[PDB]
Amino acid sequence: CPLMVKVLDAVRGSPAINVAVHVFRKAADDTWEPFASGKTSESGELHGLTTEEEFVEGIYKVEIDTKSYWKALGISPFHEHAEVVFTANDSGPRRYTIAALLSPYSYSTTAVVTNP
Amino acid sequence: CPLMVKVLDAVRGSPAINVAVHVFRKAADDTWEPFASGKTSESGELHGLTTEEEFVEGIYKVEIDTKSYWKALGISPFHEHAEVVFTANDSGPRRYTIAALLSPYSYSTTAVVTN
Amino acid sequence: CPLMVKVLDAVRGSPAINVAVHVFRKAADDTWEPFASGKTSESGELHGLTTEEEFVEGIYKVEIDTKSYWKALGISPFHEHAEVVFTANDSGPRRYTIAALLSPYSYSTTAVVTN
Amino acid sequence: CPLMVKVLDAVRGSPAINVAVHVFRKAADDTWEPFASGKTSESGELHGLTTEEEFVEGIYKVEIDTKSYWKALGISPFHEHAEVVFTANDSGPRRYTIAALLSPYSYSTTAVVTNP
Ligand SMILES: COc1cc(C(=O)c2ccc(C)cc2)cc([N+](=O)[O-])c1O
Numbered sequence A, D: 001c002p003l004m005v006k007v008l009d010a011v012r013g014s015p016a017i018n019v020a021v022h023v024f025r026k027a028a029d030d031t032w033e034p035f036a037s038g039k040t041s042e043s044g045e046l047h048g049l050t051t052e053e054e055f056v057e058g059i060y061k062v063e064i065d066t067k068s069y070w071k072a073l074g075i076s077p078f079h080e081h082a083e084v085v086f087t088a089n090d091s092g093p094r095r096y097t098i099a100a101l102l103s104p105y106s107y108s109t110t111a112v113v114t115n116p
Numbered sequence B, C: 001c002p003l004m005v006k007v008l009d010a011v012r013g014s015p016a017i018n019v020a021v022h023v024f025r026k027a028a029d030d031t032w033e034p035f036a037s038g039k040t041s042e043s044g045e046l047h048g049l050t051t052e053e054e055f056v057e058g059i060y061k062v063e064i065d066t067k068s069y070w071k072a073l074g075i076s077p078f079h080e081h082a083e084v085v086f087t088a089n090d091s092g093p094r095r096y097t098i099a100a101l102l103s104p105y106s107y108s109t110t111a112v113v114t115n
């Protein structure tokens, strides 16, 4: 599993469950092509987005649907979504965890990149 | 000044100076229309982006060119840029500060919205 | 003003107003000696804590009374308080801003140190 | 394992390995009594600090030795250590993960609290 997304809720001190995530990859014509999508589990984690074969070098955008998350909980937040945009696999295959910590008016994101 | 952007460097403990910032407004066709731009000052702040007259309700994107900032310091960063996407609302308070705190493999953003 | 403390609320997107802040200096016997204190203003800022003459090199602790802040808002928080412990150094730049960004179960802190 | 500590490095995009952690508990006389200590593993995690029986209700301080971490890597950081101070188990036993994200002049900490 070369791309994993983990989301935490800083208000409740819990995993952020059922957060929708959409991943895009920049195509040859410079548009954002849909690449993979899913939702976080009870642990706040989203596994199984892609495969080693499919996750080639490119520029990827991970869009974490934070507004949809807060509004499903009945809260009006500030951001539409969090966007994490990065070049992947340009020195060979790596494993990427994109972690996000959410509050209604703030979020932080970090990447943990490992070499198998 | 209804919109201000402030950028900070978590590695050196300093304002992030001379960082390019581009603001876009979402158009009716869902594309991003250039709206305003500038570079952060010696304080890490970018003032004067827009006016109350121009800054109507809608969805805006603030793009912060973090990659060039880190590379000009000789540091290899993870992200292409940082993006902050939000709705401007007239029911809320009138002044928006979008603050960003930068590290090579991480960034955070908060909104401080006041009258 | 060699030391300023700024506190922000990540839940409401606002300055954190009327937050108690206590600063201590580490004494020769390793205890914490009261040094300065105050409450954040309407801007979330606390100015005037000390002077260049009083703020000598050494280890300081800034304690931010986050628990009372959240409870006054009717919110149950995780931490007793936030603590920031650091060394003041004359080799560095002269002005220290300790900024804190608060959520009920999380907080972050950065130092912005400038001339 | 009712108390776990996880530390990440925001400069390198990696777990923060070999970070020393000291846990204290406020005693009846209001002093900080040493409670447990350890160091983060190759995954950035520290398991095995305490037991369900030993981890009674109280006020705990988790001291993450961030300066020692950065100085062992040859970097001069701003903070002496990160301190996370919280009441535990006052509504019955819970499981606590204290997560920290480190940069030389900044850190963030979050708690993930679950009910077995
Ligand atoms: C990256 O892995 C994790 C991160 C965190 C964080 O709290 C967090 C902090 C800052 C950011 C930006 C993101 C995550 C907590 C858990 N955990 O409870 O297992 C993790 O596994």
Ligand SMILES: COc1cc(C(=O)c2ccc(C)cc2)cc([N+](=O)[O-])c1O
Residues within 6 Å of the ligand: A106, B006, B008, B097, B099, B100, B101, B108, B109, B110, B112, C006, C008, C097, C099, C100, C101, C108, C110, C112
């Ligand atoms: C030095 O002056 C400021 C510092 C910062 C921060 O350090 C901050 C932390 C987390 C984040 C995400 C952003 C910035 C914030 C504001 N501000 O918001 O007004 C300041 O005016």
